[PDB]
mmCIF file of C-alpha atoms in Angstrom:
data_model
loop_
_atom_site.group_PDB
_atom_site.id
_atom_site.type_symbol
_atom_site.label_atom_id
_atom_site.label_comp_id
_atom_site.label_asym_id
_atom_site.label_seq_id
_atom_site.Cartn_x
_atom_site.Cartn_y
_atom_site.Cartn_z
ATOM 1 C CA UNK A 27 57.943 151.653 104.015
ATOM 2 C CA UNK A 28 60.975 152.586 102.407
ATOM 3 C CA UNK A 29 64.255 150.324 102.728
ATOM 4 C CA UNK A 30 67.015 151.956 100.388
ATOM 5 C CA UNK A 31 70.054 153.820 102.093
ATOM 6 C CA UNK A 32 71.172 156.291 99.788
ATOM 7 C CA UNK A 33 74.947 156.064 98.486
ATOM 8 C CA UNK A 34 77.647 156.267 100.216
ATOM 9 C CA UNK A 35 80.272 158.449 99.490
ATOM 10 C CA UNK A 36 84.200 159.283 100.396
ATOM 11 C CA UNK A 37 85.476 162.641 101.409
ATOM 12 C CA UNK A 38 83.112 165.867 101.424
ATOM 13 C CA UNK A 39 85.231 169.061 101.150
ATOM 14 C CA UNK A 40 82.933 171.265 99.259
ATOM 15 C CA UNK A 41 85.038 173.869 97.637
ATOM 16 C CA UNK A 42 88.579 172.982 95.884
ATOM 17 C CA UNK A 43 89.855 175.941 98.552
ATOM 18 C CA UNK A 44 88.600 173.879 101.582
ATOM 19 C CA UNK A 45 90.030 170.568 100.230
ATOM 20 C CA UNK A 46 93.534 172.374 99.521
ATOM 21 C CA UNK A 47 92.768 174.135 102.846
ATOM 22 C CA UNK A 48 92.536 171.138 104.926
ATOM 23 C CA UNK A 49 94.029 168.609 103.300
ATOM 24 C CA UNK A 50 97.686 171.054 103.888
ATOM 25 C CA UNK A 51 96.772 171.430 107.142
ATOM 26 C CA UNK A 52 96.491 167.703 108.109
ATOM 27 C CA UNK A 53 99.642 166.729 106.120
ATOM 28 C CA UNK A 54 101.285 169.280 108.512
ATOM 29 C CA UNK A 55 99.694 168.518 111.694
ATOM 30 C CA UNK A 56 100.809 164.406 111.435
ATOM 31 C CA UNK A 57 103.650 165.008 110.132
ATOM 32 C CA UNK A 58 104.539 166.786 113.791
ATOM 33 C CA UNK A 59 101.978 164.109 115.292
ATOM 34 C CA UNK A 60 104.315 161.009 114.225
ATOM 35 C CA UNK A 61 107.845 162.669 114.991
ATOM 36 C CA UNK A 62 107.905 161.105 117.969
ATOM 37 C CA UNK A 63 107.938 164.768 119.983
ATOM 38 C CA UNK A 64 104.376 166.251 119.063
ATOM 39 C CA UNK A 65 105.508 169.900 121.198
ATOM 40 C CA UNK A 66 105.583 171.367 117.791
ATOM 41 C CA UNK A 67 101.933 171.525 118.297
ATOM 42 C CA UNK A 68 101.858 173.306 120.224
ATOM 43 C CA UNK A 69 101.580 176.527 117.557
ATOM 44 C CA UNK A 70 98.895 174.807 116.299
ATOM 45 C CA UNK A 71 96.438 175.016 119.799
ATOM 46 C CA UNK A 72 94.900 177.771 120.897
ATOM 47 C CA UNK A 73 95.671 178.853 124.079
ATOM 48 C CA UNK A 74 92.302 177.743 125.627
ATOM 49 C CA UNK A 75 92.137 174.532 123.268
ATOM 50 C CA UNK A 76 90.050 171.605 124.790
ATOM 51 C CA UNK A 77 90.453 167.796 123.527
ATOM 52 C CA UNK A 78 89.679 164.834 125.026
ATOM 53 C CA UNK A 79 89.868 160.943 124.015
ATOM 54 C CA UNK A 80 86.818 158.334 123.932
ATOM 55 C CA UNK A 81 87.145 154.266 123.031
ATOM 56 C CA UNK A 82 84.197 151.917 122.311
ATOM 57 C CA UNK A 83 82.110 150.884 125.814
ATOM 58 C CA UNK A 84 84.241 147.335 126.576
ATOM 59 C CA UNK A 85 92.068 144.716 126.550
ATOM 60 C CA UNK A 86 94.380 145.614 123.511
ATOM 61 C CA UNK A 87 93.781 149.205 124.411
ATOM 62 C CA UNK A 88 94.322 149.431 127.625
ATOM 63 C CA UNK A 89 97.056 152.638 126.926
ATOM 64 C CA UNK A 90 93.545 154.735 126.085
ATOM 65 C CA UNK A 91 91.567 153.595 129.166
ATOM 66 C CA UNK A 92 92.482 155.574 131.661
ATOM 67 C CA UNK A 93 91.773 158.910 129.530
ATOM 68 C CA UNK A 94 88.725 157.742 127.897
ATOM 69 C CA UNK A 95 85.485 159.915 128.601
ATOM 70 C CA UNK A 96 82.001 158.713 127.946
ATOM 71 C CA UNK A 97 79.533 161.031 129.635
ATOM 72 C CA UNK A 98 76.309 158.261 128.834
ATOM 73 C CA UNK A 99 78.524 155.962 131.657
ATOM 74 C CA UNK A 100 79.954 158.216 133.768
ATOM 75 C CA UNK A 101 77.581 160.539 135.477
ATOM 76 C CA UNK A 102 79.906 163.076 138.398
ATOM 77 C CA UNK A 103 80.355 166.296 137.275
ATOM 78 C CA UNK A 104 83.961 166.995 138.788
ATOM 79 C CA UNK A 105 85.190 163.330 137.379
ATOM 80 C CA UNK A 106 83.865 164.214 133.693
ATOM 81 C CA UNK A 107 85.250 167.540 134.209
ATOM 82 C CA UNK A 108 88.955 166.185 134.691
ATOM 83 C CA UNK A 109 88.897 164.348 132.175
ATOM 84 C CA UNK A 110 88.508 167.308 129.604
ATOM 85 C CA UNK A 111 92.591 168.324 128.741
ATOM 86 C CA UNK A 112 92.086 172.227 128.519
ATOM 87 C CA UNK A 113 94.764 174.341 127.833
ATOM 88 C CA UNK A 114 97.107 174.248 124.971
ATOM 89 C CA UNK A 115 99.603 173.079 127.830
ATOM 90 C CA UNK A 116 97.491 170.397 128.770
ATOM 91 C CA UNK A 117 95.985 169.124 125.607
ATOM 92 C CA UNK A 118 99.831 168.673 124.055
ATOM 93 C CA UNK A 119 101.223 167.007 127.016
ATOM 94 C CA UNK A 120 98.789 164.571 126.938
ATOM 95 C CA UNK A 121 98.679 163.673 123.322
ATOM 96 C CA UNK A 122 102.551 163.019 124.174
ATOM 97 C CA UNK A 123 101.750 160.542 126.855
ATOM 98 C CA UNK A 124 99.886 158.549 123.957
ATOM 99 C CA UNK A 125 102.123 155.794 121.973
ATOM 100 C CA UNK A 126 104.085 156.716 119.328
ATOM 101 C CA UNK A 127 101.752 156.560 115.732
ATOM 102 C CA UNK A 128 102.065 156.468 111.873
ATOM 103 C CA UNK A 129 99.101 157.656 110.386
ATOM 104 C CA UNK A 130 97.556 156.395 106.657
ATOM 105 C CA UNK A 131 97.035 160.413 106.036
ATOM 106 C CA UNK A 132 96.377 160.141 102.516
ATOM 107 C CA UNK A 133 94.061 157.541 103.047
ATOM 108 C CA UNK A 134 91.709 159.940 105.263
ATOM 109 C CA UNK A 135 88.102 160.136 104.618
ATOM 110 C CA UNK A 136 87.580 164.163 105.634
ATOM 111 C CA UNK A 137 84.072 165.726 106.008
ATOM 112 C CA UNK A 138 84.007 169.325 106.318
ATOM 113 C CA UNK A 139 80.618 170.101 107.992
ATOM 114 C CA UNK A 140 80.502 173.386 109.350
ATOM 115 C CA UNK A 141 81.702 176.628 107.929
ATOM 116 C CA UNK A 142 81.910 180.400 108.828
ATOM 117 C CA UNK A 143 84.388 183.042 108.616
ATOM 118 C CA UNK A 144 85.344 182.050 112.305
ATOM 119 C CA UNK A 145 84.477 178.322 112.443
ATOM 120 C CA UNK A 146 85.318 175.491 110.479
ATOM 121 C CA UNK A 147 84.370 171.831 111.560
ATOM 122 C CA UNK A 148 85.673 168.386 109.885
ATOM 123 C CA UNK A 149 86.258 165.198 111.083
ATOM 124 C CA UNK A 150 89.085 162.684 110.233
ATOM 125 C CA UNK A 151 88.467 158.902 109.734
ATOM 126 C CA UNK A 152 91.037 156.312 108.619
ATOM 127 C CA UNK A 153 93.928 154.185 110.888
ATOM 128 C CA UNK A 154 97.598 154.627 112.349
ATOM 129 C CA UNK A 155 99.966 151.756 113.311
ATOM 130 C CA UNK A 156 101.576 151.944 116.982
ATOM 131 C CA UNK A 157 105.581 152.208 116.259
ATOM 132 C CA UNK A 158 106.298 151.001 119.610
ATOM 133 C CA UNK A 159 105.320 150.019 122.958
ATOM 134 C CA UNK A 160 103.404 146.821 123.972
ATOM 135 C CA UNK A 161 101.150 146.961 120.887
ATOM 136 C CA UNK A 162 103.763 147.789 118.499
ATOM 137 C CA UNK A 163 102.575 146.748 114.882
ATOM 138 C CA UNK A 164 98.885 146.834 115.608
ATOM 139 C CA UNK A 165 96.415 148.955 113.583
ATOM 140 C CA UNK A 166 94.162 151.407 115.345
ATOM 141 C CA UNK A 167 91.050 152.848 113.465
ATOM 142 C CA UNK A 168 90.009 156.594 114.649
ATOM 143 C CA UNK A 169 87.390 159.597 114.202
ATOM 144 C CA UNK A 170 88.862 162.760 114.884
ATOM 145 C CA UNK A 171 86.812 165.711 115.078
ATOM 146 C CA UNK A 172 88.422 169.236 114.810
ATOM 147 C CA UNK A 173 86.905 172.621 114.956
ATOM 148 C CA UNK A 174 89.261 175.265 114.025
ATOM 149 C CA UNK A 175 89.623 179.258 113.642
ATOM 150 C CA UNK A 176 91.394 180.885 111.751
ATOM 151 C CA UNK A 177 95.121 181.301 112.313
ATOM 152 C CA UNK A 178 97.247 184.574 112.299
ATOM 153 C CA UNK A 179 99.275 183.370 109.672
ATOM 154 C CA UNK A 180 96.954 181.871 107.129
ATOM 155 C CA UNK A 181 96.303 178.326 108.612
ATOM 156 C CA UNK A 182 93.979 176.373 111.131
ATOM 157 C CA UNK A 183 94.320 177.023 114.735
ATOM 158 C CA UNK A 184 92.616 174.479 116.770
ATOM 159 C CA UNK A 185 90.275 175.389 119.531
ATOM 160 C CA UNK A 186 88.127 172.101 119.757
ATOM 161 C CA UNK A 187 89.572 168.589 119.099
ATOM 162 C CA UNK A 188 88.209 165.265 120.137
ATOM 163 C CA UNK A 189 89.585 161.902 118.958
ATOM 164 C CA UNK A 190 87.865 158.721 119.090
ATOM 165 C CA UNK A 191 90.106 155.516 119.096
ATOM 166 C CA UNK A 192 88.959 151.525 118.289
ATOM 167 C CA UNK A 193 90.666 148.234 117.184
ATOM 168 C CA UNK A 194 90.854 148.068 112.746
ATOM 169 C CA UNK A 195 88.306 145.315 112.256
ATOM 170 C CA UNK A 196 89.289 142.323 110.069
ATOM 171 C CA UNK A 197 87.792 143.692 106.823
ATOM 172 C CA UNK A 198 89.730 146.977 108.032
ATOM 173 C CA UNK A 199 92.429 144.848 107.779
ATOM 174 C CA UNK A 200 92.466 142.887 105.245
ATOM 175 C CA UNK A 201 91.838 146.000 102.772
ATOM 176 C CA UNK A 202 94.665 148.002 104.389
ATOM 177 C CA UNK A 203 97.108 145.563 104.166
ATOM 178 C CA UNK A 204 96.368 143.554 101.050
ATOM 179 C CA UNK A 205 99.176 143.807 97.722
ATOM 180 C CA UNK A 206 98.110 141.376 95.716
ATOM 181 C CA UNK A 207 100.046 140.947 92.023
ATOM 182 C CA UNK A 208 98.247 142.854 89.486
ATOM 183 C CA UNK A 209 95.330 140.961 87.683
ATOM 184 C CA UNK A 210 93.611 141.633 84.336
ATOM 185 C CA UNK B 30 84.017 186.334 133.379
ATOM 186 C CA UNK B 31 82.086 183.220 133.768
ATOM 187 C CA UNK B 32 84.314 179.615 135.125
ATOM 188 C CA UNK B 33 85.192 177.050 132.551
ATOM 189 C CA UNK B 34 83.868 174.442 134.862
ATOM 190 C CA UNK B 35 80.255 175.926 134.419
ATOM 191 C CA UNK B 36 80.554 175.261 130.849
ATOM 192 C CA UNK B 37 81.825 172.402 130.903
ATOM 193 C CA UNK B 38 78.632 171.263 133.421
ATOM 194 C CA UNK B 39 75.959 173.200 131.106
ATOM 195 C CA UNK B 40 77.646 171.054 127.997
ATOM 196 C CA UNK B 41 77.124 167.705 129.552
ATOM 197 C CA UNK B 42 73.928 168.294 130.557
ATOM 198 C CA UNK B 43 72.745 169.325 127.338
ATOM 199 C CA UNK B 44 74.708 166.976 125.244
ATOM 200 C CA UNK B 45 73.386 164.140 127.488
ATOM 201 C CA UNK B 46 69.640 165.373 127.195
ATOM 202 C CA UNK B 47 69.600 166.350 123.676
ATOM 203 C CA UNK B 48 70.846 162.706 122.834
ATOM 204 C CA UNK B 49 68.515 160.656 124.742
ATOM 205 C CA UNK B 50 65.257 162.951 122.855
ATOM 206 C CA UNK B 51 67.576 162.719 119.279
ATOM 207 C CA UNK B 52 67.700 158.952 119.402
ATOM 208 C CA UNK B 53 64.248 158.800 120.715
ATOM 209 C CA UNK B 54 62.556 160.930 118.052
ATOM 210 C CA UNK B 55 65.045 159.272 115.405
ATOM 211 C CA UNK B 56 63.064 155.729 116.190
ATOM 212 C CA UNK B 57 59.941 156.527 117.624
ATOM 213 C CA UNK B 58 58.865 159.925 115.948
ATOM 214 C CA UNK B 59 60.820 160.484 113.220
ATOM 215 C CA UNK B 60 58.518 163.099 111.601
ATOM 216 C CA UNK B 61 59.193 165.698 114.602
ATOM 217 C CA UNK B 62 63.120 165.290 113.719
ATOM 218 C CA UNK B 63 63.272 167.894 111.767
ATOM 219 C CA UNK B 64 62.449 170.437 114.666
ATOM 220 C CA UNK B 65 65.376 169.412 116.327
ATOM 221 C CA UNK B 66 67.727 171.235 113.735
ATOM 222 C CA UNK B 67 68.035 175.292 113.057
ATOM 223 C CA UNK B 68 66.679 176.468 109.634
ATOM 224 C CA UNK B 69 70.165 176.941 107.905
ATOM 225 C CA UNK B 70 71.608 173.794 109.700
ATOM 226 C CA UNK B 71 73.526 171.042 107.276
ATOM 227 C CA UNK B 72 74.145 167.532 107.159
ATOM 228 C CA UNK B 73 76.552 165.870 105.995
ATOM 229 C CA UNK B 74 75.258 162.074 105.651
ATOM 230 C CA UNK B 75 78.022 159.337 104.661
ATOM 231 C CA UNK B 76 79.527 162.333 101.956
ATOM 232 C CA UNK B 77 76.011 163.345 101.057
ATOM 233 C CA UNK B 78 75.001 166.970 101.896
ATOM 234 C CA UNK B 79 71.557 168.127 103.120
ATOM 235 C CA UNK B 80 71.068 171.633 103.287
ATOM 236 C CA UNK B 81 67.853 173.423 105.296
ATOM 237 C CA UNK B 82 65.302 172.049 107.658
ATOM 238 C CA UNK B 83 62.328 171.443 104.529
ATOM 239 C CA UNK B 84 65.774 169.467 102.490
ATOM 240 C CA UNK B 85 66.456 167.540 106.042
ATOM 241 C CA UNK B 86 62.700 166.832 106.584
ATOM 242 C CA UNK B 87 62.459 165.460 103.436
ATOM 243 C CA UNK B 88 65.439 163.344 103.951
ATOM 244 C CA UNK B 89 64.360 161.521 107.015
ATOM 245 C CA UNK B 90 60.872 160.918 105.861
ATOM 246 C CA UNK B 91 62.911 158.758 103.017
ATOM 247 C CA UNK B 92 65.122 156.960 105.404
ATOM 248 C CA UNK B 93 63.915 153.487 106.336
ATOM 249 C CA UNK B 94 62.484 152.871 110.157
ATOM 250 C CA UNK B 95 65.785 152.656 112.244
ATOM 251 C CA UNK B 96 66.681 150.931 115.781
ATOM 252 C CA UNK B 97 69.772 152.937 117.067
ATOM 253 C CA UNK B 98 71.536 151.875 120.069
ATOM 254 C CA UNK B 99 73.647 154.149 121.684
ATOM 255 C CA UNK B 100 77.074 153.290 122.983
ATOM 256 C CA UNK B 101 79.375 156.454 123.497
ATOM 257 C CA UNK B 102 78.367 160.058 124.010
ATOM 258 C CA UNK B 103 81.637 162.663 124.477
ATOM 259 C CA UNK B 104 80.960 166.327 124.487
ATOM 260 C CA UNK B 105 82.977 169.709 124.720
ATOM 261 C CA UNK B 106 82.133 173.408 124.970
ATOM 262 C CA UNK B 107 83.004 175.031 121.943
ATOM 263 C CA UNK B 108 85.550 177.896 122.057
ATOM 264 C CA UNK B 109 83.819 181.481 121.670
ATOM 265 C CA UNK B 110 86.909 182.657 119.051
ATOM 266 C CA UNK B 111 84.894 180.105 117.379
ATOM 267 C CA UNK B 112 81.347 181.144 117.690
ATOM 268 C CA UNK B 113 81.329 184.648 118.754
ATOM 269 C CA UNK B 114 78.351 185.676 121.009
ATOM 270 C CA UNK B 115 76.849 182.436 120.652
ATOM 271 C CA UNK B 116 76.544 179.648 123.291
ATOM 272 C CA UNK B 117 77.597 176.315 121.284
ATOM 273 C CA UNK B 118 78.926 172.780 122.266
ATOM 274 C CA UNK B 119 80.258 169.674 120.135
ATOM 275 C CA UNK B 120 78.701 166.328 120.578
ATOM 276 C CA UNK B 121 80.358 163.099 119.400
ATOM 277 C CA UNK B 122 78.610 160.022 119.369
ATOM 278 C CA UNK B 123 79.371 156.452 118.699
ATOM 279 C CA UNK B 124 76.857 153.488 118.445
ATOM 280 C CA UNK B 125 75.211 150.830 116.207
ATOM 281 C CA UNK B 126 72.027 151.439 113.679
ATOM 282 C CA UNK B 127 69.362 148.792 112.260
ATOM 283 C CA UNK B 128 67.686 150.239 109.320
ATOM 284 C CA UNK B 129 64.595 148.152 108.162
ATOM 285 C CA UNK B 130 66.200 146.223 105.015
ATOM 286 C CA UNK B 131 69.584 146.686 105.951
ATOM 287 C CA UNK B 132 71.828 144.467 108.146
ATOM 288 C CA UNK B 133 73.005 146.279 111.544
ATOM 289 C CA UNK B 134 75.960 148.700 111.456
ATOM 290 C CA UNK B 135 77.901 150.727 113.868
ATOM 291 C CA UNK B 136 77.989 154.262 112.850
ATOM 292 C CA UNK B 137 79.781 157.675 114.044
ATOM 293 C CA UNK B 138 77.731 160.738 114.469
ATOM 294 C CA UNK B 139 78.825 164.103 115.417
ATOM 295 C CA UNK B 140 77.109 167.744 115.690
ATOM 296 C CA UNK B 141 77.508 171.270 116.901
ATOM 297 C CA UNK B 142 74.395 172.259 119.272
ATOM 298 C CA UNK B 143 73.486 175.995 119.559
ATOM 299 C CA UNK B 144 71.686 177.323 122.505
ATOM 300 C CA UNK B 145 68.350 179.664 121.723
ATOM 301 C CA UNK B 146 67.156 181.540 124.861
ATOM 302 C CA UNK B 147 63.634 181.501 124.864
ATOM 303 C CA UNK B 148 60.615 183.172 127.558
ATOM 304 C CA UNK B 149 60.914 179.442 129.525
ATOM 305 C CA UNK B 150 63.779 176.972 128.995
ATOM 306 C CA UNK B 151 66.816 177.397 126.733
ATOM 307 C CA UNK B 152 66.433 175.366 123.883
ATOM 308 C CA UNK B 153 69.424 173.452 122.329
ATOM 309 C CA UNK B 154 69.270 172.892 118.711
ATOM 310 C CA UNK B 155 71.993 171.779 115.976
ATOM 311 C CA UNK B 156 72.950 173.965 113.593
ATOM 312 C CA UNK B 157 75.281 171.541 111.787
ATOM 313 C CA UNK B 158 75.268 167.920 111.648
ATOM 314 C CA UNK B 159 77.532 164.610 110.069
ATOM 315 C CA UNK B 160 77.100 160.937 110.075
ATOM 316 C CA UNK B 161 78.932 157.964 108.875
ATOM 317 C CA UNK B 162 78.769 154.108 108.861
ATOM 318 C CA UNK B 163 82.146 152.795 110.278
ATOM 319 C CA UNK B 164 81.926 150.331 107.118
ATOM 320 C CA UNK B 165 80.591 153.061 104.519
ATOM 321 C CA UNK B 166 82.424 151.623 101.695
ATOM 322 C CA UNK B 167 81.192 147.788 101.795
#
């Protein structure tokens, strides 16, 4: 029986064009995210966009409880159905009901996993500090899938987006925050 | 032509169903894993790419004996300017792993399904796949 995990690595892209591709796109997209108004994307949605929010099964997150969706616990139909922002109307005015973020973009571990001329599929890992509110100062860690088209211009337009938001753990933490003076 | 609600409904059921076998196969049967994933379908595994059904086969017969327990399942038709003509829907999973040898870890798993008419039942399948430990770097 064999007991070795093979190695872990950061961000898969696979073509400098993707990486350029993406990367741009994300830099754009939080830049609009933190503003503290995200309507601007709105031009980044597809009309018939769909995104919806999930936490860990459980507090200091109590803001993302009553929009969390887990289909394993909750079983009605029209319930889980609710619960699914559709619309590019819908999906934007509910990311601005969230708190207020600043996002560690260039510290985002990206995996771009599906491909087409149509399709492409990445998702988003890394953490964002709440500006304000009643956990102002605290660091969130996320996964954010996306699955995008295409867009008119020559960017991403988003048809598929769902973000998944937990509590930084300690090591999370520690790493994020340290500065210690330079050693030899 | 057809309402959202129905597929939203068809993508819950089939996320929901194709997770409980996934998991199931993943511990129990791992060898029939494989058959669970479309020819051309991908993986991306903690930055690692696996590319083909024989390449994916070969990949879990190498991984150690796993334990998964699963915590969070979200799911969400996916847009047909997306995947023209074809039926699809995104999974996203969250849990925690044992792998024989290696302490427990919680992990983050998403995939695209694809659905395959067939003479009896539709038959979901993924057609891409990624993985990654929440602590991949440790």
């Amino acid at each position: 029986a064999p007991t070795t995990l093979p190695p872990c690595k950061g961000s898969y892209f696979g073509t400098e064009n993707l990486k350029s591709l993406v990367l741009h796109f994300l830099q754009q997209y939080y830049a609009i995210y933190d503003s503290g108004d995200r309507q601007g994307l709105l031009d980044a949605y597809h009309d018939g966009a769909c995104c919806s929010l999930s936490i860990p099964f459980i507090s200091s997150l109590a803001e993302y409880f009553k929009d969390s969706r887990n289909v394993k616990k909750l079983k009605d139909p029209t319930l889980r159905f609710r619960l699914l922002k559709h619309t590019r109307l819908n999906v934007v005015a509910f990311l601005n009901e969230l708190p207020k973020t600043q996002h560690d973009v260039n510290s985002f571990v990206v995996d771009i996993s599906a491909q087409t001329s149509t399709l492409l599929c990445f998702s988003v890992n890394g953490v964002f500090k709440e500006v304000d509110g009643k956990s102002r100062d605290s660091l969130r860690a996320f996964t954010r899938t996306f699955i995008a088209v295409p867009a008119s211009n020559s960017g991403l337009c988003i048809v598929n987006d769902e973000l998944f938001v937990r509590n930084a753990s300690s090591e999370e933490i520690q790493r994020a925050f340290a500065m210690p003076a330079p050693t030899p | 032509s057809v309402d959202f609600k129905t597929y939203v409904d068809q993508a819950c059921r089939a996320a929901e169903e194709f997770v409980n076998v996934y998991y199931t196969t993943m511990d129990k049967r791992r060898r029939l894993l494989s058959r669970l994933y479309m020819g051309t379908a991908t993986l991306v595994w903690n930055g690692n790419a696996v590319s083909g059904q024989e390449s994916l086969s070969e990949f879990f017969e190498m991984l150690p004996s796993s334990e998964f327990q699963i915590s969070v399942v979200d799911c969400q038709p996916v847009h047909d300017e997306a995947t023209p003509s074809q039926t699809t829907v995104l999974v996203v999973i969250c849990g925690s792993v044992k792998f024989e040898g290696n302490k427990q870890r919680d992990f983050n798993q998403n995939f695209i399904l694809t659905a395959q008419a067939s003479p009896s039942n539709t038959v979901w399948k993924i057609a891409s796949d990624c993985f990654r430990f929440q602590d991949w770097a440790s």
